[PDB]
Paper text:
Thus, we chose to engineer the loop L1 of the 56-residue immunoglobulin-binding domain B1 of the streptococcal protein G ([name]).35–38 The solvent exposed loop L1 in wild type [name] is a type-I β-turn with lysine at the i + 1 position and threonine at the i + 2 position that lacks a COi+1 → COi+2 n → π* interaction. However, to have a better control over the turn conformation, we decided to introduce a type-II′ β-turn. Through subsequent X-ray crystallography and computational analysis of synthetic [name] proteins with amino acid substitutions at the i + 2 residue of the β-turn, we show that amino acid side-chain identity and its rotameric conformation have a direct influence on the strength of an n → π* interaction. Gratifyingly, the thermal denaturation of the [name] proteins shows a good correlation between their stability and the strength of an n → π* interaction at the β-turn.
Our earlier results indicated that the β-branched amino acid d-Val at the i + 1 site stabilizes a type-II′ β-turn more than d-Ala. Thus, we synthesized 2, with d-Val–l-Ala in loop L1, which readily crystallized and X-ray diffraction data were collected to a maximum resolution of 1.9 Å. The structure of 2 overlaps closely with the tertiary structure of [name] (backbone RMSD 0.39 Å), although with a significant displacement of loop L1. Gratifyingly, the d-Val COi+1 and l-Ala COi+2 in the type-II′ β-turn engage in an n → π* interaction, where the torsion angles of l-Ala at the i + 2 site (ϕ, ψ = −59.7°, −42.2°) are remarkably close to the mean torsion angles of a right-handed α-helix (ϕ, ψ = −62°, −41°)42. Thus, to obtain a quantitative estimate of the n → π* interaction energy (En→π*) at the i + 2 residue in 2, 3, and 4, we resorted to NBO analysis, which clearly indicated a decreasing En→π* in the order 2 > 3 > 4. The Ramachandran plot of the i + 2 residue in the type-II′ β-turn of 2, 3, 4, and 5 revealed that, as the strength of the n → π* interaction increases, the torsion angles of an amino acid in a non-helical region in the absence of the stabilizing intramolecular hydrogen bond are gradually altered to occupy the right-handed α-helical region. Therefore, we chose to substitute the solvent exposed COi+1 in the type-II′ β-turn of 2 by CSi+1. Thus, towards the synthesis of i + 1 thionated [name] (d-Valt–l-Ala; 2a) (the thionated residue is denoted by superscript “t”), we obtained a clean 46-mer polypeptide up to the l-Alai+2. However, on completion of the 56-mer 2a on a solid support, following the acidolytic removal of protecting groups, the mass spectrum corresponded to a 45-mer fragment without the l-Alai+2.
Author numbering: 1 to 56
The structure:
Amino acid sequence: DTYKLILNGXALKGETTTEAVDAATAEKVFKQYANDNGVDGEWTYDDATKTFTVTE
């Protein structure tokens, strides 16, 4: 299924997606995406909409 990540670094905000087999596998992809783009901090997950957020 399609999973979504909403990043908030502060000034820079964005949204990416990933096609993953389960929520844990999307989470791993998103965690390394966030780190590679300078956003590190507070995570959330909305199971009903397959949506993660990470906020600096």
